[PDB]
Design a protein around this ligand. Sequence first.
Ligand SMILES: NC(=[NH2+])c1ccc2[nH]c(-c3cccc(-c4ccccc4)c3[O-])nc2c1
Ligand SMILES: [Ca+2]
Ligand SMILES: [Cl-]
Length: 223
Amino acid sequence: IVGGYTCGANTVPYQVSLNSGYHFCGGSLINSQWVVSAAHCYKSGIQVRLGEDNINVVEGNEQFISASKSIVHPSYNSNTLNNDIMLIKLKSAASLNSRVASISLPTSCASAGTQCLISGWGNTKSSGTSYPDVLKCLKAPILSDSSCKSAYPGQITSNMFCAGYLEGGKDSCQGDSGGPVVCSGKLQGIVSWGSGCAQKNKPGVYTKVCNYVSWIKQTIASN
Ligand SMILES: NC(=[NH2+])c1ccc2[nH]c(-c3cccc(-c4ccccc4)c3[O-])nc2c1
Ligand SMILES: [Ca+2]
Ligand SMILES: [Cl-]
């Protein structure tokens, strides 16, 4: 997260770190046995790490659970990143408490102007690599579709939305992919892509979760 602030330990109880010997993507806990992340974060050997704050120190509250299966959306396109969503089933259920809690799926999509919270352990520099130990947060608004399409002509599908600041300075960045964009307590987006990080007129692009709720529900119900 570039230009964000330190969240504070366990203040984002639904945030998870996907780990394969190092942190490579974020994700969101939506119930005790399932996590939602981005399809492009897929790989085998994923260990989901819940209740984390400093990802390099065991401070207590952590639960390390292996993924039993990862389900990439069948229509995911790696060239356009359209349908960049994945569901991860955990080998065993997580113990939910105040430090580990799930987030709710939305009932309706959000409107431009809605302020959301984006979090993650990704890079904090736009020009260079500085990876934090603790979780970073950024409050950012959803932009209108015209500003988004005007920023990325021909690359935005109906399953994406832009959130951020056109002046540059604040944005999600590498290491944050797969993580949550929560607005009014509902998971509205998943960190997907962007051009550089925090550059002027190049906002972050997110997967529009409101468009996949029946898919998530049906998929979970059958697995
Ligand atoms: N500017 C942004 N809002 C942004 C957000 C998420 C990103 N994630 C990345 C990213 C960059 C290189 C590699 C990966 C990657 C690729 C495969 C697996 C895991 C991560 C990224 O997510 N850049 C990103 C840029
Ligand atoms: Ca830790
Ligand atoms: Cl267009």
